[PDB]
């Protein structure tokens with residue numbers, strides 16, 4: 265009787281339920297940003313979620329701002345992701361790769377040749393950024409030349425080519441949470457005078473060009489996109505978020521994409537914030553035609569209310585899913601939720617990653633089995 269637990273049809277994909285694993289950076293790639301068997305166990309374990317969206321995956325070295333995130337720009341990376349897609353599919357799961365460019369939220373230490381991070385405009389985020397050599401202040405990033413936006417779009421297109429080859433069911437363009445695309449959208453970050461700055465239309469141009477480029481690799485019904493309609497995460501700010509997001513959503517409505525993925529203002533990236541905003545999901549449901557994913561601070565009961573009230577079609581869970589590989593079964597049988605441990609979110613090993621327990625140990629055995637089979641197959 266939970267709507268969260270109703271199978272849902274995603275323009276062809278037979279989702280087990282209406283619950284989504286939110287994208288989650290775990291900082292556990294192998295050398296050269298290549299996914300490993302351990303990574304496949306983790307996704308295999310969580311494959312009773314209707315849809316998995318992966319951790320943000322950089323489309324290029326230039327797009328990375330945190331250590332040991334996986335990439336999707338080399339063959340060796342694609343091979344690694346194949347273990348992941350295989351294992352999730354053997355468990356009858358569905359999965360999309362979230363494509364990432366960190367923008368200015370990076371450090372020369374991460375960059376090819378120790379070049380500056382790139383952004384719309386030469387404006388550093390506030391605060392400090394973890395690097396290979398400990399905590400350092402954010403640097404002023406380099407403002408991208410007009411001509412270079414084309415080359416970033418092409419990175420996304422190559423990245424989607426690699427994704428399709430890796431065997432992902434679809435892709436999600438990360439346009440949220442303070443990163444390259446988001447910096448383009450908001451006029452607090454975007455001070456450009458060319459055809460990608462100024463007018464609301466112009467700021468979104470890049471988002472539309474990325475979408476044009478990837479929908480040449482995947483059918484548009486397999487391209488998703490994530491927005492953060494109203495957040496301070498990473499020194500974001502816009503002079504008029506209602507106006508900017510209204511336009512951006514209505515345009516998106518007409519591109520017949522797989523879904524729109526909206527993060528609730530009560531999330532500041534990875535933590536909860538007290539915050540007044542009307543730019544939550546209720547405000548966008550009217551403005552977006554197709555399949556709508558709501559994410560951010562939900563529980564069983566508040567997620568269920570979203571679906572009953574027809575506010576969204578899918579509810580994403582991030583932190584609960586880190587801790588509860590079988591969240592849907594727990595919801596379903598009214599079980600206690602395993603607590604999540606923030607200290608093991610980022611970096612590390614099995615601990616706080618693949619060692620959260622299931623209701624049913626057999627689920628656990630089946631994930632291990634598929635993940636080992638996936639490794640032998642793609643050895």
Ligand SMILES: Cc1cc2nc3c(=O)[nH]c(=O)nc-3n(C[C@H](O)[C@H](O)[C@H](O)COP(=O)(O)O)c2cc1C
Pocket residue numbers: 286287288289290318319320362438440441490527531533534535559560561562580581582583584609610
């Ligand atoms: C450890 C951690 C990693 C995350 N990584 C990503 C990411 O890679 N991409 C993204 O778009 N959001 C990311 N988020 C934001 C979450 O996807 C989600 O919006 C947030 O956790 C709020 O959802 P929740 O309340 O269910 O946890 C992350 C959050 C956490 C706590």
